[PDB]
Design a protein around this nucleic acid. Structure first.
Ligand SMILES: [K+]
Ligand SMILES: [K+]
Ligand SMILES: [Mg+2]
Ligand SMILES: [Mg+2]
Ligand SMILES: [Mg+2]
Ligand SMILES: [Mg+2]
Ligand SMILES: [Mg+2]
Ligand SMILES: [Mg+2]
Ligand SMILES: [Mg+2]
Ligand SMILES: [Mg+2]
Ligand SMILES: [Mg+2]
Ligand SMILES: [Mg+2]
Ligand SMILES: [Mg+2]
Ligand SMILES: [Mg+2]
Ligand SMILES: [Mg+2]
Ligand SMILES: [Mg+2]
Ligand SMILES: [Mg+2]
Ligand SMILES: [Mg+2]
Ligand SMILES: [Mg+2]
Ligand SMILES: [Mg+2]
Ligand SMILES: [Mg+2]
Ligand SMILES: [Mg+2]
Ligand SMILES: [Mg+2]
Ligand SMILES: [Mg+2]
Lengths: 51, 99, 148, 193, 203
RNA sequence: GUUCUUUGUAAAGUGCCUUCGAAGAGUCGAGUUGUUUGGGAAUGCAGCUCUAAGUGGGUGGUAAAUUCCAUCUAAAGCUAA
RNA sequence: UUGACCUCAAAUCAGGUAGGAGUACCCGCUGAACUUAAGCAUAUCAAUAAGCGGAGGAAAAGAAACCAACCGGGAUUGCCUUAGUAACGGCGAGUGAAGCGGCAAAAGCUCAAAUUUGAAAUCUGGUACCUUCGGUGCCCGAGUUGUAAUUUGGAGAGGG
């Protein structure tokens, strides 16, 4: 929710809605960076998950 | 387009055996490109109409396509761009509630 | 060379041939084409009528290659045939095996009909032909073939 | 300063023209330098004819379309029909031009033929072989001169059919001149109420 | 990817979202210094298009340039000449505001090379640009043969010599009949056309 | 030329069929102003206002509408003689 | 309270870089008037002198949003021509290119926009060693707001 140039992610809710992909606007590009071992990520995706 | 063999007249020029060279990938610079069609549709959804596009839609709905084309020619550069913009606006109007 | 000029001869004469009363001054009548309408009007109207004003319509971005069409009169019509074969074509003036002349290859666009040609059939290939030129060619028994 | 009966001159010398005067005193020195440069380039590059093979090409602009001349490079279609790839031809000494197109079968065939002649008359050395000295010839253009195509025969039979070529030209000109107005007249005459 | 969406969205400059972002960003840029380092490109897709890469040695600077004509700097409007040259207030500075922006940015970061620049915002008084610069001394740029061309001394202050995109535009460097005056250089063409060529055997 | 090297089941090229084919935005373009050009209902440049499209866009040296055609592919970049 | 992130700072922090000179030639900005028009204001001088910014051994331009209208040429540059011409101009004084053609030299190309996603495969720096215009290992860091490979329209990519 805090991408400093917001144009990078403004279309993401609409794209996810158009493709029927569940999306959540979550707090922290730093938190997603901790998720993906980076400083920031600005996005995080799950495509396959274990049984 | 076959030459007449003489130096004057409609299809003037020497009669030569034509070849029809292979089409260059240029001349397809403004192609359809489903990718860009999808992206342009999505962006048109995310960002709505410009103020002049809203005014053009109002003019199409109320005062007529000729007035809309005049205003679009004033706003944009030329008559062809005005015609294309008015066609896009009335397509938007059709795709709106009055399907 | 300088030694043959009249200025060597004018050494010792004060005015250098330029006159004592009206000397050699800088520009007594103005520079260049000055006064062509006011004080050189006589020298303009005489020896240069038509100089001033506009006379026709303009042509933006005129290319002379569009109008390239060198004219060859019928009076030669045979210098395009090499001298070696010219005599053997002049003799045996037959409607069959008539010499073929490519005027365009020779570098001409239009064939004109000034002169008169011998009574020998000749196949003339040209881009353009004058009416009288073609008439004389057929009278001599040749034909005009239009090419491009 | 309009003197006696002389043509009107137009000498454009009203600027500081003496500040830009190029006298080609170095014509001979530059010719010697060009000959030296050609010699060192021929020595430096492998035995190789100092320029790339050029295609045959029809000049534009009817003032010159009657004549044929060397072009820039062979088209991709010509290279493919000769049996090479553009990348390989560029390395074995063939100029390739992606811009030129083939719409004339005669010119295309002539270029394919001279490409085949070039391949038959050159020896490509192995990258990792012996490569005996092959007696460098300095001009591929001189080896494969451009020939003007012959259009007709020296003598032929007269085939006059009463065509009146002058009348043919006049009628073609008139038909071009009145094509639009006659089309418009036909459109208004086929109105069908 | 997201760059195509950025590209298409950026063209909708009078949409509500881009108008709001324009207002907020123009206020922020006006608050900041006239020339200031930008931590990252504001328009990353445009930066990539103009040659920027997200590696060490690539630098973005935001710059503010005054809009309008170039008033003649003559004192009290006196030109001291013929009436054809008396113009003071409607003279147009035959060089772009983008060119001024990247020239000032290059003067500031004289150690870098101006690669490119792009418009980001404007108000009545100012036009805002972001200048992409490359560090020719950084090893990441001295290697990476795709970019070490800018390390050659022939590319010093290309923004000052008009060798960037806006420089070539202002110089008129384009092919065709519309650029006969300026195809190989305006002054070079003038010199060639006004040179008197004389050979040893005069023609 | 010659010697250690052996790169590498790595890289590249070519035929056939199929599905595609992303190609640069306050930019093009337009108006107006100034300057400039041989460019003349406006050659380029620049300021301000407007501001595109994708079988599109620019050009085709007389402004405009309609209909075709031809030719390239801008708004990013390097390069010896 | 601790640990991040973003942005912004500081250090005589580690390593670098810029200035200034020269300035014949080169790339731009700015910019006259004397002068010519037998006066003079548009014009001319001149898109020049002066002023300013920026390079190199050459610079710039350069591989077509070109020229053409052809039977089509095919990056750029330069010479001979085109041509004192088309055209511009108190259509006055004056000014004034470009296509083609011959020739010199020739050379072609690469990014952005593509999911590597079964694996950031990329890179600066420090340090140690070495056969040191660099290589290898390790360690921080940069980087997913995108660094490699792959593609540049002439194409090309994904499958078989
Ligand atoms: K006298
Ligand atoms: K003055
Ligand atoms: Mg005496
Ligand atoms: Mg005396
Ligand atoms: Mg950084
Ligand atoms: Mg100003
Ligand atoms: Mg493009
Ligand atoms: Mg000026
Ligand atoms: Mg026309
Ligand atoms: Mg360059
Ligand atoms: Mg220190
Ligand atoms: Mg003087
Ligand atoms: Mg005077
Ligand atoms: Mg006087
Ligand atoms: Mg006076
Ligand atoms: Mg000076
Ligand atoms: Mg030096
Ligand atoms: Mg040199
Ligand atoms: Mg250079
Ligand atoms: Mg290209
Ligand atoms: Mg050319
Ligand atoms: Mg002449
Ligand atoms: Mg002039
Ligand atoms: Mg490949």
């Amino acid at each position: 929710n805090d991408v400093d140039p917001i144009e990078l992610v403004v279309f993401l809710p609409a794209l996810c809605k158009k493709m029927g992909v569940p999306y959540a606007i979550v707090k922290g590009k730093a938190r997603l960076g901790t998720l993906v071992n980076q400083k920031t990520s600005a996005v995080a995706a799950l495509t396959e998950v274990r049984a | 387009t076959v030459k007449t063999g003489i130096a004057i007249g409609l299809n003037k020029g020497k009669k030569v055996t034509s070849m029809t060279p292979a089409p260059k990938i240029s001349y397809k610079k403004g192609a359809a490109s489903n990718r860009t069609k999808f992206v342009r549709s999505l962006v048109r959804e995310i960002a709505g109409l410009s103020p002049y596009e809203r005014r053009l839609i109002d003019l199409i709905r109320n005062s007529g396509e000729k007035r809309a084309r005049k205003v679009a020619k004033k706003r944009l550069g030329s008559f062809t761009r005005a015609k294309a913009k008015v066609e896009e606006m009335n397509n938007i109007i059709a795709a709106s509630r009055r399907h | 060379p300088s030694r043959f000029t009249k200025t060597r001869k004018h050494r010792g004469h004060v005015s250098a041939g330029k006159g004592r009363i009206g000397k050699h001054r800088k520009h007594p009548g103005g520079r260049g084409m000055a006064g062509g309408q006011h004080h050189h009007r006589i020298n303009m109207d005489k020896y240069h009528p038509g100089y001033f004003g506009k006379v026709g319509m303009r042509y933006f971005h005129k290319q002379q290659a569009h109008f390239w069409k060198p004219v060859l009169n019928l009076d030669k019509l045979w210098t395009l045939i090499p001298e070696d074969k010219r005599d053997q074509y002049l003799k045996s003036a037959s409607k069959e095996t008539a010499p073929v002349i490519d005027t365009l290859a020779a570098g001409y666009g239009k064939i004109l009909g000034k002169g008169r040609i011998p009574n020998v059939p000749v196949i003339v290939k040209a881009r353009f032909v004058s009416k009288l030129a073609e008439e004389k060619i057929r009278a001599a028994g040749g034909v005009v073939e239009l090419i491009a | 300063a309009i003197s006696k009966n002389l043509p009107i001159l137009k000498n454009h010398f009203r600027k500081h023209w003496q500040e830009r005067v190029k006298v080609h005193f170095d014509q001979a020195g530059k010719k010697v330098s060009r000959r030296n440069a050609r010699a060192t380039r021929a020595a430096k590059i492998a035995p190789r004819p100092l320029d790339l093979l050029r295609p045959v090409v029809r000049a534009p602009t009817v003032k010159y379309n009657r004549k044929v001349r060397a072009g820039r490079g062979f088209t991709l279609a010509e290279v493919k029909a000769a049996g090479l790839t553009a990348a390989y031809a560029r390395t074995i000494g063939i100029a390739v031009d992606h811009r030129r197109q083939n719409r004339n079968q005669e010119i295309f065939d002539a270029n394919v033929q001279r490409l085949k002649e070039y391949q038959s008359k050159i020896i490509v050395f192995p990258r990792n072989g012996k490569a005996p000295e092959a007696e460098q010839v300095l001009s591929a253009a001189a080896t494969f001169p451009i020939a003007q195509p012959a259009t007709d025969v020296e003598a032929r039979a007269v085939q006059d059919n009463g065509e009146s070529a002058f009348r043919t030209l006049r009628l073609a000109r008139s038909e071009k001149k009145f094509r639009g107005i006659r089309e418009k007249r036909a459109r208004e005459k086929a109105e069908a109420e | 990817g997201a760059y195509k969406y950025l590209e298409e969205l950026q063209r909708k400059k009078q949409s509500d979202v881009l108008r709001f972002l324009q207002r907020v960003r123009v206020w922020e840029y006006r608050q900041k210094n006239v020339i200031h380092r930008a931590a990252r490109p504001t328009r990353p897709d445009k930066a990539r298009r103009l040659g920027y890469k997200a590696k060490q040695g690539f630098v973005i600077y935001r710059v503010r340039v005054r809009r309008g004509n170039r008033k003649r700097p003559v004192p009290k409007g006196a030109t001291y000449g013929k009436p054809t040259n008396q113009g003071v207030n409607e003279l147009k500075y035959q060089r772009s505001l983008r060119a001024t922006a990247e020239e000032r940015v290059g003067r500031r970061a004289a150690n870098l090379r101006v690669l490119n620049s792009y418009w980001v915002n404007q108000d009545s008084t100012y036009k805002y640009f972001e200048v992409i610069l490359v560090d020719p001394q950084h090893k990441a740029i001295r290697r990476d043969a795709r970019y070490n061309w800018i390390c050659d001394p022939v590319h010093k202050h290309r923004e000052a010599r008009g060798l960037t995109a806006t420089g070539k535009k202002s110089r008129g460097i384009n092919k065709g009949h519309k650029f006969n005056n300026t195809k190989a250089g305006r002054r070079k063409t003038w010199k060639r056309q006004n040179t008197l060529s004389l050979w040893r055997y005069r023609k």
